[PDB]
Design a protein around this ligand. Structure first.
Ligand SMILES: CCCCCCCC/C=C\CCCCCCCC(=O)OC[C@H](O)CO
Ligand SMILES: CCCCCCCC/C=C\CCCCCCCC(=O)OC[C@H](O)CO
Ligand SMILES: *C/C=C(C)/C=C/C=C(C)/C=C/C1=C(C)CCCC1(C)C
Ligand SMILES: CCCCCCCC/C=C\CCCCCCCC(=O)O
Ligand SMILES: CCCCCCCC/C=C\CCCCCCCC(=O)O
Ligand SMILES: CCCCCCCC/C=C\CCCCCCCC(=O)O
Ligand SMILES: [Cl-]
Length: 262
C-alpha cells in the first residue's frame, strides 16, 4: 500500500491522466476481447473448448483488476496546487500480484490443453507449473513490499522468484518441444511461436518489478504502468488470440464442422 514507490511522488497532470488512460484503456481492450473469445467458442470442438473459456475468465479477471486500479488511482490523488498529490492510502500494485495467482494458471492450463495433453500428464504437469508459478508470485509479492524500504531484499526475493520462473519455463518448453508433433493443421509451427511470445511478454514483468531500483521517480511510475500494459496485452490478449487460432485449426483438422466453416 504505502510501501510502493507510487506513494512517494506528486504527479503532473500529464503523468496522472496518462496512467489513468492506460488502465481504462486496458479495461476496454480486455472486455472487448472477451466478446470475441465468447462468440468464437461455438466454432471450437468440445476437445479444446475449455481453452477459450479460460481466455474469457482471464479477460474478466484482468479487466476487473485494471478497472479497480483505475478507480483506486483516481481516489488516491487530488489535483492540488498544480499537481496530483496523495490523498489516501488506496493504490498499490499488490493487487496485480494477487491477480496473477489466478490468471497465470489459466494461461498455462489452456496451453497444455491445445498441446493435447490429457489425464495423468495433464494433471501432473498442471500441478508442478501452478506450484512453480505460485512460488514465483509469492516471492515476487514479498519482494515488492520492500521496493521502497529495502532494495537489497527486493533483489534477493527477485532472485528466488526468478528460480521458479526459469524452472517454470523449462517445463513449459519441454512439453512443447516433445508434443508439438501431435498437433494438427500445422499448429506444430504456431505453438513454437506462442512459446517465444510467452518468453518475451512475461519477461517484461520482472523488468517492471525492477523499475524502483533504476528509475526511482515519477516517470518510473509511468514507465512501469506502460510496461505492465504492454505485458498484459501480449500475454493475455494476443496470447489467447493465438491459443484460439490453434484451437480452431486443430478442431477443423479433427473433423469439427463449425470449425471447418470458420
Ligand atoms: C524448485 C524446483 C526443484 C524441484 C523440481 C520440480 C520437479 C519437476 O520439475 O517436475 C516437473 C515434471 O517435468 C512434470 O511432469
Ligand atoms: C537463468 C539462468 C539460466 C538461464 C539459461 C537459459 C534459459 C533457460 C530458460 C528455459 C528455456 C526453455 C528450455 C526448453 O525449452 O527445454 C528444452 C528441451 O529440453 C528440449 O527438448
Ligand atoms: C497476465 C500476467 C502475467 C502473465 C504475469 C506474469 C508474471 C511474471 C512472469 C512475474 C515474474 C517475476 C519474476 C520472474 C521475478 C521478479 C518478480 C516477478 C513476479 C515480477
Ligand atoms: C465492449 C467493449 C468494452 C466496453 C467498454 C466498457 C467500459 C469502459 C469504461 C470503464 C469504466 C471505468 C473507467 C474509469 C475512469
Ligand atoms: C495446486 C492445485 C492444483 C493445480 C492443478 C490443476 C490441475 C488441472 C486439472 C484439469 C483442468 C481442466 C481440465 C480440462 C481438460 C479437458 C478434458 C475434458 O473436457 O474432459
Ligand atoms: C512451505 C515450506 C517452505 C517453502 C519454501 C519457499 C521458498 C522460499 C525460498 C527462499 C526465500 C528466502 C528469502 C529470505 C529473505 C531475506 C530477507 C530477510 O532478512 O528477511
Ligand atoms: Cl492479471
Amino acid at each position: 500500500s504505502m510501501k510502493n514507490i507510487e506513494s512517494l511522488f506528486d504527479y503532473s497532470a500529464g503523468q496522472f491522466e496518462f496512467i489513468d488512460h492506460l488502465l481504462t484503456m486496458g479495461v476496454g481492450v480486455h472486455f472487448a476481447a472477451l466478446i470475441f473469445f465468447l462468440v468464437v467458442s461455438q466454432f471450437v470442438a468440445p476437445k479444446y473448448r475449455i481453452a477459450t473459456a479460460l481466455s474469457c475468465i482471464v479477460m474478466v479477471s484482468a479487466g476487473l483488476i485494471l478497472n479497480s486500479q483505475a478507480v483506486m488511482w483516481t481516489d488516491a490523488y487530488a489535483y492540488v496546487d498544480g499537481s496530483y498529490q496523495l490523498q489516501d492510502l488506496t493504490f498499490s500494485n499488490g493487487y496485480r500480484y494477487v491477480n496473477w495467482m489466478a490468471t497465470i494458471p489459466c494461461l498455462l492450463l489452456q496451453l497444455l490443453i491445445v498441446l493435447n495433453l490429457k489425464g495423468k500428464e495433464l494433471f501432473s504437469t498442471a500441478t508442478w507449473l501452478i506450484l512453480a508459478a505460485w512460488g514465483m508470485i509469492i516471492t515476487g509479492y514479498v519482494g515488492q513490499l520492500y521496493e521502497v524500504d529495502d532494495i537489497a531484499q527486493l533483489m534477493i526475493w527477485g532472485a528466488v522468484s526468478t528460480a521458479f520462473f526459469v524452472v517454470m519455463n523449462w517445463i513449459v518448453g519441454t512439453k512443447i518441444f516433445k508434443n508439438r508433433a501431435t498437433m494438427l493443421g500445422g499448429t506444430d509451427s504456431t505453438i513454437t511461436k506462442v512459446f517465444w511470445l510467452m518468453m518475451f511478454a512475461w519477461t517484461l514483468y520482472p523488468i517492471a518489478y525492477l523499475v524502483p531500483a533504476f528509475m526511482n521517480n515519477a516517470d518510473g511510475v509511468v514507465l512501469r504502468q506502460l510496461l505492465f500494459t504492454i505485458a498484459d496485452i501480449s500475454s493475455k490478449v494476443i496470447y489467447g488470440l493465438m491459443i484460439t487460432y490453434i484451437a480452431i485449426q486443430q478442431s477443423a483438422a479433427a473433423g469439427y464442422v463449425p470449425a471447418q466453416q470458420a
